[PDB]
Design a protein around this ligand. Structure first.
Ligand code: 1DG
Length: 159
């Protein structure tokens, strides 16, 4: 089982300038619930985007994909290919744009948070993968964040 988990603006943007272009701390508990106790896989840039105090993400085996055969990530497993990354029975891919696109064909679950923020795509942004008709989904109810942003959860699956 490979699952993907991300948060996106309605437009599809998930990343800009090396970070996430909104604040949504309400997202954190759901991300932990899905991922805790499991192997998580991320691209090298996503690892770089984690603050030092939070990386590796605790309670999860952190696996970092990089083409640098020598790359350095304390508390994480650096691998050079997605096949090497994917060895655990249940794996959650936690980004970024490159790695979601790489892992999508392997995935049978996505847990998506949609952020109701007006954020037109710009060139060079990180973007969420598009889910086609092979996926079936349930849409959750909108909630307001302490930031003022509405957000909602989708759970998608395909067998
Ligand atoms: N909104 C989001 O949900 C996310 C945004 N981000 C954002 O995406 C952006 C990073 O995505 P990118 O597409 O630029 O990069 P990555 O996919 O993380 O890494 C690409 C790197 O992986 C590596 N890579 C890519 N393809 C391969 C490959 N085929 N083989 C080996 N390595 C590969 C390469 O590494 P090296 O340069 O060290 O060689 C490549 O440069 C940042 O803005 C980041 O803040 C990342 C994860 C999530 C995320 O943090 C997250 C997930 C769930 N809930 C809340 C947040």
């Amino acid at each position: 089982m490979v699952g993907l988990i991300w948060a996106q603006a309605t437009s599809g943007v998930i990343g800009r300038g090396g970070d996430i272009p909104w604040r949504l701390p309400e997202d954190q508990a759901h991300f932990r619930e899905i991922t805790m106790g499991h192997t998580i896989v991320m691209g090298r840039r996503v690892w770089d985007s984690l603050p030092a105090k939070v990386r590796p993400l605790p309670g999860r085996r952190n696996v970092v994909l990089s083409r640098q055969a020598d790359f350095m990530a304390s508390g994480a497993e650096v691998v050079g290919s997605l096949e090497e990354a994917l060895t655990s029975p249940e794996t959650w891919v936690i980004g970024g744009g490159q790695v979601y696109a790489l892992a999508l064909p392997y995935a049978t679950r996505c847990e998506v948070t949609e952020v109701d923020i007006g954020l037109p795509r710009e060139a060079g942004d990180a973007l969420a993968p598009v889910l086609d008709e092979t996926w079936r989904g349930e849409t959750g109810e909108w909630r307001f964040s302490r930031s003022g942003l509405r957000y909602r959860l989708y759970s998608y699956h395909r067998s």
